[PDB]
Amino acid sequence: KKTPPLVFYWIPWFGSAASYGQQPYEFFESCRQKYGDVFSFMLLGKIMTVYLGPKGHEFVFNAKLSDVSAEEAYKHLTTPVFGTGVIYDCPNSRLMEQKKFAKFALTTDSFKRYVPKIREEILNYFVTDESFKLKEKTHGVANVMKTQPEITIFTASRSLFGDEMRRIFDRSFAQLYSDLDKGFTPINFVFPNLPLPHYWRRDAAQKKISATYMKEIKLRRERGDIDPNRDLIDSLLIHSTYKDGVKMTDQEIANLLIGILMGGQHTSASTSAWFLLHLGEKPHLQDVIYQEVVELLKEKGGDLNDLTYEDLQKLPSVNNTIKETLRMHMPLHSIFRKVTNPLRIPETNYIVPKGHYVLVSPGYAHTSERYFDNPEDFDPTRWDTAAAKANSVSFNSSDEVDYGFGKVSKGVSSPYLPFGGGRHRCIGEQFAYVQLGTILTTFVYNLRWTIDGYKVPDPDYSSMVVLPTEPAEIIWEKRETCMF
């Protein structure tokens, strides 16, 4: 009957890019107050159709394969970074199965092993990195936009790839990852390939790192066994065959490893950076966690080195802090699909034309007064309440569906959806919690920190993930239990 209201703009190309780009949530809210929950806005020559709130979550996440395409929207963002033939550079059925393959490395039995490895890496960083140097220093300053991206790549690599990779992680591979990371930008939506050096370094890093992985894949296939059913490389060695019998090439497997690492490390880097800062602003929250962790280990007759995956299950303060950080700082502010066939928006007369892009934003709801009281207050204790819990469950469907990587909720109508929903749902949620939880406990047990200001930095929405604005540091002291 009707196409959704288009948000007025003056600049013929730019559209609403400036405002949407600077502050996505504010922009959405201004648009909502004028037009309602469903509106369109022009962006770099593309028409973005937004559906705010839980009903929007349903509309986009649970949209039919035949109606919208995620790979149409993401191809240019990721393919040049990860490599060809995986993730968005393949049909959806291939993606579904790749997710299934990777999930075999993301189970409890693996996690139980990952935890000490992830802690060890953190501890090594504490001793060797100039931010900490805990054997020499007693006070210090940590730029969390340096420490967290680095710790996250060390812990994730050690965990998912194993010790060998950790072993070869010298400064040469450091440059590559930096060269590749620098190529992982929203600029790829607009400029995926250019002949200025930055791209050259990126393409070259992709080839080099994937080759490295390929070598390790082949080497392990032949001889390797550090320990049983350890990791992601083990998993893909075994689980590399599609349902039609087609098998991933070792180059494709390598490329999938890059995707998984890059996504996981980024989302985790930002999340840990954010909860270090927010905890700095509110140091008493640190002491709560500390108290909980220390009592727990006292029960146990142990020290931090005794802290297990199972222990992480007994620490609600840790897991509430991560929830709250993902509420206030979802790493993805926007999630796109391309409209491939005219969508009718149920409970309306609107029709979304083919060629539009549909945009869903759980972050909006996360940070909206409509769903969360005092949304801009960082309070992990809200997750012990009914209201918050109610915001985490989907009213309409408690039934579950399997898209090919295991059963997920059919219902996505929850205001709080940090890990998305439906077909393209995250598979890294539990791993993220294991990694972030270990990071958080290892920090809190050894250190206490504050921030210089009275406020956490403003978020930067121009990055691949929502990162803290550039000056972002914590000032740390040692806790009586500091291991060094």
Ligand X SMILES: O[C@@](Cn1cnnn1)(c1ccc(F)cc1F)C(F)(F)c1ccc(-c2ccc(OCC(F)(F)F)cc2)cn1
Binding residues for heme: 426
Site for ligand X in 15-34 (CB under 6 A): 21
Determine if 334 is a binding residue for ligand X (CB under 6 A). Answer: yes
C-beta of 78 vs 110, nearer to ligand X: 78
- Residues annotated within a binding site: 426
**Residue from the set 271, 320, 367, 394 that interacts with ligand HEM by CB under 6 A:** 271
Minimum distance of ligand HEM from residue 483's CB (angstroms): 27
C-beta of 46 vs 166, nearer to ligand X: 46
Determine if 353 is a binding residue for ligand X (CB under 6 A). Answer: no
C-beta of 356 vs 448, nearer to ligand X: 356
Residue 262 near which of ligand X, ligand HEM, none (CB within 5-8 Å, type-dependent) = ligand X
Site for ligand X in 87-116 (CB under 6 A): 87
Determine if 16 is a binding residue for ligand HEM (CB under 6 A). Answer: no
C-beta of 69 vs 317, nearer to ligand HEM: 69
Residue 464 near which of ligand HEM, ligand X, none (CB within 5-8 Å, type-dependent) = ligand X
Stretch that binds ligand X, among 132-140, 303-311, 328-336, 377-385 (CB under 6 A): 328-336
Minimum distance of ligand HEM from residue 335's CB (angstroms): 4
**Residue from the set 49, 62, 255, 267 that interacts with ligand HEM by CB under 6 A:** 267
Stretch that binds ligand HEM, among 28-36, 42-50, 186-194, 420-428 (CB under 6 A): 420-428
Determine if 186 is a binding residue for ligand X (CB under 6 A). Answer: yes
3-class SS string, the chain: CECCCECCCCCCCCECHHHHHHCHHHHHHHHHHHHCCEEEEEECCEEEEEECCHHHHHHHHCCCCCCEEHHHHHHHHHHHHHCCCCHHHCCHHHHHHHHHHHHCCCCHHHHHHHHHHHHHHHHHHHHHCCCCCCCCCCEEEEEHHHHHHHHHHHHHHHHHHCHHHHHCCCHHHHHHHHHHHCCCCCHHHHCCCCCCHHHHHHHHHHHHHHHHHHHHHHHHHHCCCCCCCCCHHHHHHHCCECCCCCECCHHHHHHHHHHHHHHHHHHHHHHHHHHHHHHHHCHHHHHHHHHHHHHHHHHHCCCHHHCCHHHHCCCHHHHHHHHHHHHHCCCCCCEEEEECCCEECCCCCEEECCCCEEEECHHHHHCCCCCCCCCCCCCHHHHHCHHHHHCCCCCCCCCEEECCCCEEECCCCCCCCCCCCHHHCCCCHHHHHHHHHHHHHHHHHHEEEECCCCCCCCEECCCCCCEECCCCEEEEEECCCCCC
Contacts with ligand HEM by CB under 6 A lie at 70, 95, 99, 260, 263-264, 267-268, 271, 326, 331-332, 335, 418-420, 424, 426-428, 431-432
